[PDB]
Amino acid sequence: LLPVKYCKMRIFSGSTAAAPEEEPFEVWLEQATEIAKEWPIPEAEKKRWVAESLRGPALDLMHIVQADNPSISVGECLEAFKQVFGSTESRRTSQVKYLRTYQQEGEKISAYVLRLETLLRRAVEKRAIPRNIADQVRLEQVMAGANLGNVLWCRLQELKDQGPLPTFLQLMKVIREEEE
Amino acid sequence: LLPVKYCKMRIFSGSTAAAPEEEPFEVWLEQATEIAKEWPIPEAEKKRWVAESLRGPALDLMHIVQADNPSISVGECLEAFKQVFGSTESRRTSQVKYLRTYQQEGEKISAYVLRLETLLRRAVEKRAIPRNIADQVRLEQVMAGANLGNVLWCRLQELKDQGPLPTFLQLMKVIREEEE
Amino acid sequence: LLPVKYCKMRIFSGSTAAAPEEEPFEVWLEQATEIAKEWPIPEAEKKRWVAESLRGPALDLMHIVQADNPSISVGECLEAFKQVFGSTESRRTSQVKYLRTYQQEGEKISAYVLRLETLLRRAVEKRAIPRNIADQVRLEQVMAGANLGNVLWCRLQELKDQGPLPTFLQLMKVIREEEE
Amino acid sequence: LLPVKYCKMRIFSGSTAAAPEEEPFEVWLEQATEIAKEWPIPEAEKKRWVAESLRGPALDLMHIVQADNPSISVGECLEAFKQVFGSTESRRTSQVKYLRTYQQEGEKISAYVLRLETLLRRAVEKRAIPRNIADQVRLEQVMAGANLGNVLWCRLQELKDQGPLPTFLQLMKVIREEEE
Amino acid sequence: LLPVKYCKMRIFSGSTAAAPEEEPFEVWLEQATEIAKEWPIPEAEKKRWVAESLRGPALDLMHIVQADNPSISVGECLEAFKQVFGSTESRRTSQVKYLRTYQQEGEKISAYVLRLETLLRRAVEKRAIPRNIADQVRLEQVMAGANLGNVLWCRLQELKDQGPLPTFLQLMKVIREEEE
Amino acid sequence: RRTSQVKYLRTYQQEGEKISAYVLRLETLLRRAVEKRAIPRNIADQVRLEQVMAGANLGNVLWCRLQELKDQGPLPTFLQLMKVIREEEE
């Protein structure tokens, strides 16, 4: 007799040609680890709720993993998913992929600096970039990788010379104010 | 055993290339502030229900904000979203964007005056237009920005000369009656 | 632990370029008047459940209406929606739109007579057509507006001469039997 | 606090240009007759749950039927839907439509024999085909209407000569084994 | 008053031209066998929940099966679905389809080895491949069926000569490290 | 630190260079970057193999031997990496 919302579970599939509904694996693993740790029900219910979030190749991995060992716990299943799909990158490769990341031909430069900031957090978690220079490399990698121009270059090089460098939100404010 | 409705939560993403499901940020913030203020559950549940309404770049901001400070409250998270995505416009820029807004080449003029009225409310909230002339600028900005013609121009200039000017609903009634 | 259906609320938007999900306004108003009259919860809950059924320009009207008067009741909100979107047609215009309605170039004539019957109910509610001639004008407006031919014309003119004229369902049966 | 499935109600519309969500009428009537007979709630709730399953022209029939008689019961509403949309075919026409049904240019012959078997059940319910020859007409109408060839023709004519003829499932097994 | 997730039931249809929502039959049968064995409700409820997961040709089989015997149990219904749609392959055909499976022209070779591993599990369940050589045939069928090249061929032939051969996850790790 | 990191990573084998000369040129830029504290010394070997493999005009079984060395565990010193690249130069 009462109406209610209905959150669509985060489906994952592991296909390279991912459909518009389907998350990157790290977001799905955050959902699956919630089901594994948090939810109060037995492991048989947990396995079912994890499997329902999976489609295509990733669901086939769930079948393979259970077929080898029906006595397995969901925590060990997620270790198999982390091993097959969870990214493995080295310090060399995380540094290179951050530095090689330029503004794409269709991007607004405000969207590029946000995309680039996700790669910086990735690289800091690998300990591939020291946190105490993250601001320097933000201004540098924006200026080296963006399709930049006009007085935005002047304001960014001024900020590089200013002393205390921008946080990410402040650098976005500058780039947005020039986007107008 | 009972059937019920199922409201799709308002998803937001912050991409400039927004998908057809995805709201403008101000509508999403109205939903997220409901979850922050109203709902009775602890901050850990509130964070989860806010994060589930987010997809793509805006979800990456939720991860960044939590990673800097896991002790943060949802109210302070929404202040970070307001700062990154919530619009910052000055009196000069809100006045200019209202006045520069013409009827688009495919629009019916009845749809244009409704679109234009949203920009007037925006400008009044910045205190960029005095409320006591909002009617005058509606008739003027319709007449200056629309692809207008015929006896609708005559009726609108007559209304400009009439003394007491139209409210928005009355101006729409006139423009709709000429749309037939 | 139990599974259940999930009725998608009837979304409305008021755009002329309406998306395939989105109802004509009169169907949405039937849903919104159910929420206004029937549902047991306070006006603050009613406002929220009405607003969740709205998207795009029609949601912007809900914001405008509430911003002018936060003390308003949902019944008075629906009067503002009726005034802005609810159709206003005169006896002259309802008579003309019924009579001007021909079978569209892609229509099957069985679909045309059903479309046409909706316009007759509209015109009868304006008192623009006397109920006691509705059958006569159905056969006439089918015969004058359809892409008709063959022995279906003969059977329809025979029915016009028969004495007691078809009801709508009987006229559809005839047109369907010739559709085969 | 608990997650659950959410079955999408079977929407029907009665348009000839039916959208990919929308069932053939006979499947919708099976759902609507469940709501009419089975569900425990009063007729006012039953009318609402039937109307929510309807979209476009079929919803307009629900409005017409209720407008003529607000005192009507849902059973009598479904009799009006059966009369307008429910198929009326004679023995001659059901026999002809079964026999005229050939394999379509894009069909696999295994899909054709399943499509054809639905038309045989239809014809048997009209008493247009005696049940005691249904097997004979399956092999004949497959062989006369399919884009058949190779040793599948030989195996089918052998089965026609074998004595005890295939059931539908056995005929599908043969046609599937040649599909490989 | 509370919000909740809403898992979309796994729809199946049995059309060869399957829509993007629709599972392979073996995944649907895993859902339908859960409804048949596990769920506590009577067989009449079980039949309804199975039928709601079906669309198009597969729903027509549910109608045929019930029409022949209304006294049937859901377990015997799923035996009819297994017989009509569940795959029947011999040892010869499962061996041939595994060996004939090459990397498709658009595939990344990491996706190909995962696709190929599903066919190996299929063949092992038919007892068509001895488990004690599954690793040998993985490296061979990758090397014979892939669009392979570069030092990945050298590393794979080295692994073939190494003594203890890769598990599937280890072979994927190698192929992924060369995908970079 | 930003500019020394960028100039090291942006340094590819020039169109006329032998790859043995390129890895020596590249090693001078690594010492420069380590003196700015722009690269941690404890990963200098990893970035040598990576920046050779990403910046060189490499090919043949030299790529295989270099990726093998990247997987080997204990990575080459500069002199050992030059020995490998010289032995393939022949």
Side-chain angles (χ1 to χ4, degrees), chain D residues 60-85:
Chain D
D60 300 328
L61 181 63
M62 181 59 79
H63 294 165
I64 288 159
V65 169
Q66 291 185 19
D68 278 356
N69 181 8
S71 82
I72 199 167
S73 64
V74 172
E76 293 185 48
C77 299
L78 301 187
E79 292 300 314
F81 277 87
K82 283 176 187 175
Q83 187 153 71
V84 176
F85 294 107

PDB file of all heavy atoms in Angstrom, chain D residues 60-85:
ATOM      1  N   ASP D  60      -6.817   4.772 -23.182  1.00  0.00           N
ATOM      2  CA  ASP D  60      -7.971   5.569 -23.582  1.00  0.00           C
ATOM      3  C   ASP D  60      -9.265   4.752 -23.577  1.00  0.00           C
ATOM      4  O   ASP D  60     -10.304   5.264 -23.168  1.00  0.00           O
ATOM      5  CB  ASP D  60      -7.758   6.189 -24.958  1.00  0.00           C
ATOM      6  CG  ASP D  60      -6.547   7.119 -25.046  1.00  0.00           C
ATOM      7  OD1 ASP D  60      -6.213   7.784 -24.042  1.00  0.00           O
ATOM      8  OD2 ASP D  60      -5.975   7.256 -26.146  1.00  0.00           O
ATOM      9  N   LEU D  61      -9.222   3.470 -23.953  1.00  0.00           N
ATOM     10  CA  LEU D  61     -10.384   2.608 -23.788  1.00  0.00           C
ATOM     11  C   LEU D  61     -10.761   2.470 -22.317  1.00  0.00           C
ATOM     12  O   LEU D  61     -11.946   2.539 -22.008  1.00  0.00           O
ATOM     13  CB  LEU D  61     -10.162   1.243 -24.435  1.00  0.00           C
ATOM     14  CG  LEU D  61     -11.371   0.303 -24.305  1.00  0.00           C
ATOM     15  CD1 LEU D  61     -12.600   0.835 -25.026  1.00  0.00           C
ATOM     16  CD2 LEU D  61     -11.048  -1.051 -24.915  1.00  0.00           C
ATOM     17  N   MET D  62      -9.808   2.328 -21.396  1.00  0.00           N
ATOM     18  CA  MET D  62     -10.159   2.251 -19.976  1.00  0.00           C
ATOM     19  C   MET D  62     -10.887   3.513 -19.514  1.00  0.00           C
ATOM     20  O   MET D  62     -11.914   3.422 -18.843  1.00  0.00           O
ATOM     21  CB  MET D  62      -8.920   1.980 -19.115  1.00  0.00           C
ATOM     22  CG  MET D  62      -9.258   1.880 -17.628  1.00  0.00           C
ATOM     23  SD  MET D  62     -10.439   0.578 -17.202  1.00  0.00           S
ATOM     24  CE  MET D  62      -9.355  -0.857 -17.231  1.00  0.00           C
ATOM     25  N   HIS D  63     -10.435   4.694 -19.936  1.00  0.00           N
ATOM     26  CA  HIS D  63     -11.131   5.942 -19.626  1.00  0.00           C
ATOM     27  C   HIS D  63     -12.536   5.979 -20.216  1.00  0.00           C
ATOM     28  O   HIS D  63     -13.468   6.317 -19.498  1.00  0.00           O
ATOM     29  CB  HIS D  63     -10.325   7.141 -20.128  1.00  0.00           C
ATOM     30  CG  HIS D  63      -9.009   7.363 -19.435  1.00  0.00           C
ATOM     31  ND1 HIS D  63      -7.998   8.190 -19.917  1.00  0.00           N
ATOM     32  CD2 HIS D  63      -8.673   6.943 -18.185  1.00  0.00           C
ATOM     33  CE1 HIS D  63      -7.060   8.224 -18.959  1.00  0.00           C
ATOM     34  NE2 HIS D  63      -7.443   7.490 -17.906  1.00  0.00           N
ATOM     35  N   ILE D  64     -12.720   5.609 -21.484  1.00  0.00           N
ATOM     36  CA  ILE D  64     -14.039   5.592 -22.124  1.00  0.00           C
ATOM     37  C   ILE D  64     -14.996   4.678 -21.360  1.00  0.00           C
ATOM     38  O   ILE D  64     -16.099   5.084 -21.003  1.00  0.00           O
ATOM     39  CB  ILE D  64     -13.909   5.156 -23.596  1.00  0.00           C
ATOM     40  CG1 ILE D  64     -13.251   6.269 -24.429  1.00  0.00           C
ATOM     41  CG2 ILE D  64     -15.272   4.800 -24.205  1.00  0.00           C
ATOM     42  CD1 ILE D  64     -12.628   5.752 -25.730  1.00  0.00           C
ATOM     43  N   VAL D  65     -14.567   3.455 -21.067  1.00  0.00           N
ATOM     44  CA  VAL D  65     -15.397   2.456 -20.402  1.00  0.00           C
ATOM     45  C   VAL D  65     -15.815   2.927 -19.020  1.00  0.00           C
ATOM     46  O   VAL D  65     -16.996   2.852 -18.689  1.00  0.00           O
ATOM     47  CB  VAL D  65     -14.659   1.114 -20.354  1.00  0.00           C
ATOM     48  CG1 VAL D  65     -15.343   0.093 -19.447  1.00  0.00           C
ATOM     49  CG2 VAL D  65     -14.608   0.512 -21.760  1.00  0.00           C
ATOM     50  N   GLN D  66     -14.899   3.480 -18.229  1.00  0.00           N
ATOM     51  CA  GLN D  66     -15.271   4.028 -16.927  1.00  0.00           C
ATOM     52  C   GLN D  66     -16.179   5.259 -17.034  1.00  0.00           C
ATOM     53  O   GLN D  66     -17.098   5.404 -16.233  1.00  0.00           O
ATOM     54  CB  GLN D  66     -14.017   4.355 -16.115  1.00  0.00           C
ATOM     55  CG  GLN D  66     -13.269   3.083 -15.690  1.00  0.00           C
ATOM     56  CD  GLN D  66     -12.083   3.366 -14.772  1.00  0.00           C
ATOM     57  OE1 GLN D  66     -11.961   4.412 -14.148  1.00  0.00           O
ATOM     58  NE2 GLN D  66     -11.167   2.440 -14.637  1.00  0.00           N
ATOM     59  N   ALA D  67     -15.963   6.139 -18.012  1.00  0.00           N
ATOM     60  CA  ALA D  67     -16.772   7.339 -18.177  1.00  0.00           C
ATOM     61  C   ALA D  67     -18.240   7.014 -18.497  1.00  0.00           C
ATOM     62  O   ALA D  67     -19.136   7.682 -17.988  1.00  0.00           O
ATOM     63  CB  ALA D  67     -16.147   8.218 -19.260  1.00  0.00           C
ATOM     64  N   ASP D  68     -18.510   5.977 -19.293  1.00  0.00           N
ATOM     65  CA  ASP D  68     -19.884   5.525 -19.545  1.00  0.00           C
ATOM     66  C   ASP D  68     -20.584   4.978 -18.305  1.00  0.00           C
ATOM     67  O   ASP D  68     -21.801   5.117 -18.182  1.00  0.00           O
ATOM     68  CB  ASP D  68     -19.911   4.444 -20.633  1.00  0.00           C
ATOM     69  CG  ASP D  68     -19.875   5.013 -22.048  1.00  0.00           C
ATOM     70  OD1 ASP D  68     -19.896   6.252 -22.209  1.00  0.00           O
ATOM     71  OD2 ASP D  68     -19.884   4.223 -23.013  1.00  0.00           O
ATOM     72  N   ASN D  69     -19.851   4.339 -17.398  1.00  0.00           N
ATOM     73  CA  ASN D  69     -20.438   3.693 -16.230  1.00  0.00           C
ATOM     74  C   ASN D  69     -19.445   3.596 -15.061  1.00  0.00           C
ATOM     75  O   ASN D  69     -18.800   2.565 -14.890  1.00  0.00           O
ATOM     76  CB  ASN D  69     -20.953   2.307 -16.660  1.00  0.00           C
ATOM     77  CG  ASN D  69     -21.597   1.550 -15.520  1.00  0.00           C
ATOM     78  OD1 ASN D  69     -21.805   2.067 -14.430  1.00  0.00           O
ATOM     79  ND2 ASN D  69     -21.933   0.306 -15.726  1.00  0.00           N
ATOM     80  N   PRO D  70     -19.348   4.609 -14.188  1.00  0.00           N
ATOM     81  CA  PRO D  70     -18.450   4.554 -13.036  1.00  0.00           C
ATOM     82  C   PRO D  70     -18.766   3.431 -12.035  1.00  0.00           C
ATOM     83  O   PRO D  70     -17.901   3.036 -11.268  1.00  0.00           O
ATOM     84  CB  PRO D  70     -18.536   5.937 -12.396  1.00  0.00           C
ATOM     85  CG  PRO D  70     -18.916   6.833 -13.567  1.00  0.00           C
ATOM     86  CD  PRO D  70     -19.860   5.952 -14.369  1.00  0.00           C
ATOM     87  N   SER D  71     -19.979   2.875 -12.059  1.00  0.00           N
ATOM     88  CA  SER D  71     -20.406   1.757 -11.207  1.00  0.00           C
ATOM     89  C   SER D  71     -19.950   0.369 -11.696  1.00  0.00           C
ATOM     90  O   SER D  71     -20.201  -0.621 -11.028  1.00  0.00           O
ATOM     91  CB  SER D  71     -21.923   1.800 -11.000  1.00  0.00           C
ATOM     92  OG  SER D  71     -22.641   1.239 -12.074  1.00  0.00           O
ATOM     93  N   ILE D  72     -19.289   0.284 -12.858  1.00  0.00           N
ATOM     94  CA  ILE D  72     -18.839  -0.979 -13.467  1.00  0.00           C
ATOM     95  C   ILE D  72     -17.824  -1.738 -12.587  1.00  0.00           C
ATOM     96  O   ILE D  72     -17.030  -1.123 -11.875  1.00  0.00           O
ATOM     97  CB  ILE D  72     -18.287  -0.684 -14.880  1.00  0.00           C
ATOM     98  CG1 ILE D  72     -18.226  -1.951 -15.747  1.00  0.00           C
ATOM     99  CG2 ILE D  72     -16.909   0.002 -14.825  1.00  0.00           C
ATOM    100  CD1 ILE D  72     -17.996  -1.655 -17.230  1.00  0.00           C
ATOM    101  N   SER D  73     -17.819  -3.070 -12.659  1.00  0.00           N
ATOM    102  CA  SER D  73     -16.828  -3.949 -12.043  1.00  0.00           C
ATOM    103  C   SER D  73     -15.704  -4.294 -13.002  1.00  0.00           C
ATOM    104  O   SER D  73     -15.886  -4.239 -14.212  1.00  0.00           O
ATOM    105  CB  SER D  73     -17.484  -5.207 -11.545  1.00  0.00           C
ATOM    106  OG  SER D  73     -17.986  -5.871 -12.603  1.00  0.00           O
ATOM    107  N   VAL D  74     -14.525  -4.665 -12.506  1.00  0.00           N
ATOM    108  CA  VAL D  74     -13.365  -4.941 -13.366  1.00  0.00           C
ATOM    109  C   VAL D  74     -13.628  -6.096 -14.323  1.00  0.00           C
ATOM    110  O   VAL D  74     -13.190  -6.039 -15.464  1.00  0.00           O
ATOM    111  CB  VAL D  74     -12.089  -5.161 -12.542  1.00  0.00           C
ATOM    112  CG1 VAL D  74     -10.913  -5.634 -13.387  1.00  0.00           C
ATOM    113  CG2 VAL D  74     -11.661  -3.846 -11.907  1.00  0.00           C
ATOM    114  N   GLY D  75     -14.400  -7.104 -13.926  1.00  0.00           N
ATOM    115  CA  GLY D  75     -14.749  -8.210 -14.816  1.00  0.00           C
ATOM    116  C   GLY D  75     -15.430  -7.725 -16.095  1.00  0.00           C
ATOM    117  O   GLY D  75     -15.016  -8.072 -17.196  1.00  0.00           O
ATOM    118  N   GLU D  76     -16.407  -6.831 -15.974  1.00  0.00           N
ATOM    119  CA  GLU D  76     -17.073  -6.222 -17.126  1.00  0.00           C
ATOM    120  C   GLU D  76     -16.147  -5.300 -17.934  1.00  0.00           C
ATOM    121  O   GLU D  76     -16.273  -5.236 -19.155  1.00  0.00           O
ATOM    122  CB  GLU D  76     -18.341  -5.495 -16.686  1.00  0.00           C
ATOM    123  CG  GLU D  76     -19.414  -6.437 -16.163  1.00  0.00           C
ATOM    124  CD  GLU D  76     -20.738  -5.737 -15.837  1.00  0.00           C
ATOM    125  OE1 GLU D  76     -21.237  -4.958 -16.669  1.00  0.00           O
ATOM    126  OE2 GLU D  76     -21.318  -5.995 -14.761  1.00  0.00           O
ATOM    127  N   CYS D  77     -15.182  -4.625 -17.302  1.00  0.00           N
ATOM    128  CA  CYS D  77     -14.154  -3.898 -18.048  1.00  0.00           C
ATOM    129  C   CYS D  77     -13.361  -4.848 -18.945  1.00  0.00           C
ATOM    130  O   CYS D  77     -13.216  -4.597 -20.136  1.00  0.00           O
ATOM    131  CB  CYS D  77     -13.197  -3.165 -17.113  1.00  0.00           C
ATOM    132  SG  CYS D  77     -14.082  -1.958 -16.141  1.00  0.00           S
ATOM    133  N   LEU D  78     -12.882  -5.970 -18.412  1.00  0.00           N
ATOM    134  CA  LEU D  78     -12.124  -6.930 -19.206  1.00  0.00           C
ATOM    135  C   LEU D  78     -12.973  -7.531 -20.326  1.00  0.00           C
ATOM    136  O   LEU D  78     -12.446  -7.768 -21.403  1.00  0.00           O
ATOM    137  CB  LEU D  78     -11.483  -7.999 -18.321  1.00  0.00           C
ATOM    138  CG  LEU D  78     -10.530  -7.438 -17.261  1.00  0.00           C
ATOM    139  CD1 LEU D  78      -9.813  -8.579 -16.558  1.00  0.00           C
ATOM    140  CD2 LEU D  78      -9.476  -6.504 -17.832  1.00  0.00           C
ATOM    141  N   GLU D  79     -14.281  -7.702 -20.152  1.00  0.00           N
ATOM    142  CA  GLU D  79     -15.155  -8.054 -21.274  1.00  0.00           C
ATOM    143  C   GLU D  79     -15.143  -6.990 -22.380  1.00  0.00           C
ATOM    144  O   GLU D  79     -15.105  -7.344 -23.556  1.00  0.00           O
ATOM    145  CB  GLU D  79     -16.589  -8.306 -20.793  1.00  0.00           C
ATOM    146  CG  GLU D  79     -16.728  -9.567 -19.934  1.00  0.00           C
ATOM    147  CD  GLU D  79     -16.312 -10.841 -20.673  1.00  0.00           C
ATOM    148  OE1 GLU D  79     -16.721 -11.025 -21.835  1.00  0.00           O
ATOM    149  OE2 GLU D  79     -15.572 -11.666 -20.097  1.00  0.00           O
ATOM    150  N   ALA D  80     -15.107  -5.699 -22.052  1.00  0.00           N
ATOM    151  CA  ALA D  80     -14.956  -4.662 -23.071  1.00  0.00           C
ATOM    152  C   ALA D  80     -13.590  -4.746 -23.770  1.00  0.00           C
ATOM    153  O   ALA D  80     -13.524  -4.696 -24.995  1.00  0.00           O
ATOM    154  CB  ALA D  80     -15.195  -3.288 -22.442  1.00  0.00           C
ATOM    155  N   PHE D  81     -12.499  -4.955 -23.034  1.00  0.00           N
ATOM    156  CA  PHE D  81     -11.188  -5.158 -23.648  1.00  0.00           C
ATOM    157  C   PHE D  81     -11.159  -6.400 -24.545  1.00  0.00           C
ATOM    158  O   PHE D  81     -10.674  -6.310 -25.671  1.00  0.00           O
ATOM    159  CB  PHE D  81     -10.099  -5.216 -22.580  1.00  0.00           C
ATOM    160  CG  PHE D  81      -9.637  -3.850 -22.137  1.00  0.00           C
ATOM    161  CD1 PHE D  81     -10.304  -3.166 -21.115  1.00  0.00           C
ATOM    162  CD2 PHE D  81      -8.558  -3.239 -22.791  1.00  0.00           C
ATOM    163  CE1 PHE D  81      -9.933  -1.862 -20.774  1.00  0.00           C
ATOM    164  CE2 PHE D  81      -8.176  -1.941 -22.445  1.00  0.00           C
ATOM    165  CZ  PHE D  81      -8.873  -1.250 -21.450  1.00  0.00           C
ATOM    166  N   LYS D  82     -11.712  -7.539 -24.109  1.00  0.00           N
ATOM    167  CA  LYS D  82     -11.834  -8.752 -24.932  1.00  0.00           C
ATOM    168  C   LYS D  82     -12.582  -8.448 -26.220  1.00  0.00           C
ATOM    169  O   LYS D  82     -12.163  -8.877 -27.285  1.00  0.00           O
ATOM    170  CB  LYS D  82     -12.614  -9.851 -24.196  1.00  0.00           C
ATOM    171  CG  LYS D  82     -11.843 -10.610 -23.112  1.00  0.00           C
ATOM    172  CD  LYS D  82     -12.818 -11.590 -22.443  1.00  0.00           C
ATOM    173  CE  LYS D  82     -12.214 -12.298 -21.232  1.00  0.00           C
ATOM    174  NZ  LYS D  82     -13.227 -13.150 -20.556  1.00  0.00           N
ATOM    175  N   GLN D  83     -13.670  -7.690 -26.138  1.00  0.00           N
ATOM    176  CA  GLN D  83     -14.469  -7.337 -27.303  1.00  0.00           C
ATOM    177  C   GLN D  83     -13.704  -6.443 -28.282  1.00  0.00           C
ATOM    178  O   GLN D  83     -13.747  -6.696 -29.480  1.00  0.00           O
ATOM    179  CB  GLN D  83     -15.762  -6.694 -26.808  1.00  0.00           C
ATOM    180  CG  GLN D  83     -16.760  -6.431 -27.935  1.00  0.00           C
ATOM    181  CD  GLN D  83     -18.166  -6.438 -27.360  1.00  0.00           C
ATOM    182  OE1 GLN D  83     -18.578  -5.544 -26.638  1.00  0.00           O
ATOM    183  NE2 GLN D  83     -18.937  -7.469 -27.607  1.00  0.00           N
ATOM    184  N   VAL D  84     -12.977  -5.433 -27.807  1.00  0.00           N
ATOM    185  CA  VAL D  84     -12.253  -4.502 -28.682  1.00  0.00           C
ATOM    186  C   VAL D  84     -10.946  -5.073 -29.225  1.00  0.00           C
ATOM    187  O   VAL D  84     -10.674  -4.905 -30.409  1.00  0.00           O
ATOM    188  CB  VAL D  84     -11.989  -3.171 -27.964  1.00  0.00           C
ATOM    189  CG1 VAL D  84     -11.158  -2.224 -28.828  1.00  0.00           C
ATOM    190  CG2 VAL D  84     -13.311  -2.475 -27.630  1.00  0.00           C
ATOM    191  N   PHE D  85     -10.137  -5.733 -28.395  1.00  0.00           N
ATOM    192  CA  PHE D  85      -8.792  -6.195 -28.761  1.00  0.00           C
ATOM    193  C   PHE D  85      -8.658  -7.713 -28.901  1.00  0.00           C
ATOM    194  O   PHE D  85      -7.843  -8.175 -29.696  1.00  0.00           O
ATOM    195  CB  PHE D  85      -7.791  -5.705 -27.717  1.00  0.00           C
ATOM    196  CG  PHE D  85      -7.611  -4.208 -27.660  1.00  0.00           C
ATOM    197  CD1 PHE D  85      -8.145  -3.465 -26.597  1.00  0.00           C
ATOM    198  CD2 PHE D  85      -6.862  -3.562 -28.653  1.00  0.00           C
ATOM    199  CE1 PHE D  85      -7.921  -2.085 -26.526  1.00  0.00           C
ATOM    200  CE2 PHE D  85      -6.652  -2.178 -28.591  1.00  0.00           C
ATOM    201  CZ  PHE D  85      -7.183  -1.440 -27.527  1.00  0.00           C
TER     202      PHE D  85
END
